[model samples]
Target chain A: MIIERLVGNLRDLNPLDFSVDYVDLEWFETRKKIARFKTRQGKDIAIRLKDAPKLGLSQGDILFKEEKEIIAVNILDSEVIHIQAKSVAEVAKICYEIGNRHAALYYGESQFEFKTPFEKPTLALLEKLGVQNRVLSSKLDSKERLTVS
Target chain B: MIIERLVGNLRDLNPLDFSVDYVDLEWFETRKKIARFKTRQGKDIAIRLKDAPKLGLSQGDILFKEEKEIIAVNILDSEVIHIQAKSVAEVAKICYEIGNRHAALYYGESQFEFKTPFEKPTLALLEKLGVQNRVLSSKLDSKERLTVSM
Candidate 1:
């Protein structure tokens, strides 16, 4: 199916009567403005959005909608080093360290937390500094991205 | 006077009856481990310490002491871009920007705040970021320093 634009995001939580199919995307691919791919159940799909969202496509974006079937974006989780700030100082400390190393940072599910691509070399420092951090698979929200040199 | 080590800090609040002299150091000179300078009362002094602090010397560091006199370090207030964080997000945002610039950072009186040397161009970025920042004359704590390469 050819999709010209996004119809809506499932995050709107609207109930649809049709069966929804999904196009699994790596957390990074959500930033693309145009793409050609195949969805689950072997359906060929192409998307040429009029414009990319501020950051770009998001989870659950409807790319192809039909009377009986709906195709939506599903972002897959990836490994990340995450830090959730318990105290205000922890937030500043973690952010400052990430910036100092010129690392890419992204916001976590929590407002006071951040996530970065996991690396043992960096996690050691976080542990040394008494920061509460750990590695886990999580979604990277392109729109919630932050930090760099 | 020839000093080989730190006696104590004035921050200790010792009850010393002796008169205290101070060496007014420029913000950058606090990093030196061996140096000769004159105190505020024009007293000649020398410091050739064996080691530097983890970061470096700090405000109120004492160099010498005697029955009737003493000498201590005093850092003068200088212009700086001071930022005080009102929330956790603000702290992360401001500190990240400073680190990303490879600029030197110093702790502010408040734990959630930081201060760096002032520059108009840099201040412009902070202004645009809408951070709580202002240029002010404040003492930079040498021991509480933080920075990185250009």
Candidate 2:
């Protein structure tokens, strides 16, 4: 079955009283305004967002939920630039700078991360600012916000 | 005079003498890589960011400082969409839906806001999600962060 609408947070959809199926997506695919994919049970699906999902959808997000079966969106692992800040002040500075560029940022207690197609420009800026970073392929944090005001 | 570099935070540059001048910038101008403007003193100045200031420059941010004199970047007011949630659950859902679209958001105690060049699309989504919002022109809070993790 094809899904186009977001059912929103699962916890709000009340209780889960039946079996559920999952639909997996990669970190990159989450940003596409439209796309096609398949479920674990070999079911074909398509998503065409009315407006782009700005922060990019993420794993465990509910695309559709119904009586006997529920479908959840799963984000696949991808490459990201991991930023490590030494102090809270530094974190605020780094986050603000990236946010100013309108980049999607994943926030953590001591670290932040982002996934992008090209790493050169981002890497250069971080290097110039003297912020330490590394590139790694993994399941990145999907909850992103424009770090700047 | 030209201001080419960030003098770091003002707190780091402790000084007893002070006479400061401000260059007011709109939100868009704050993000530019290069621009020309007049300081409060009517001095022509140019800013060529060797690198983009990620958080975008803001008011009270020191652009240049010297003994008894300082130049600062000032962010001007703009239009914004304010969203007020009655509960944590409401705030979470609103943030997630907004974040899902990658719009810049400013987190607040019971309210969240965003500045947009256009408000139609943002307004539409908020209505669709059953979230309440209002549009107003003001100095939007730029220190934004995602209030949700999932």
Winning candidate number (DockQ): 1
Q: Which tens-of-lDDT digit does each residue in A1-149 have in candidate 1?
A: 45678888877745667788899888778777788878887888887778657677778888877777788888778888888778765677677777888777787778677888777766776776677888998887677777442
DockQ score for model 1: 0.45
The residue ranges of model 1 lying beyond 4 angstroms of the native Cα positions read A1-4, A32-37, A40-49, A147-149, B146-150
Docking class of 1: acceptable
The CA lDDT of each predicted structure is: 0.78, 0.60
Candidate 1 chain B, poorest ten consecutive residues by summed lDDT: B141-150
Q: Write the per-residue lDDT of candidate 2 for residues B1-150, one digit (tens) a residue.
A: 666787765555554467778888876566676888898898787787787456567556777777788887777777777776554334434554555555656653433333343367778877787776777776543344332121
**Alpha-carbon lDDT of model 2:** 0.60
* Ten residues in sequence with the least summed lDDT for candidate 2 chain B: B141-150
DockQ of 2: 0.06
Runs of candidate 2 with Cα error greater than 4 angstroms are A1-149, B10-17, B109-118, B141-150
C-alpha DockQ of every model: 0.45, 0.06
Q: Least accurate stretch of 10 residues (summed lDDT) in model 2 chain A?
A: A109-118
Query: How many clashing residue pairs appear in each of the predictions shown?
Result: 0, 16
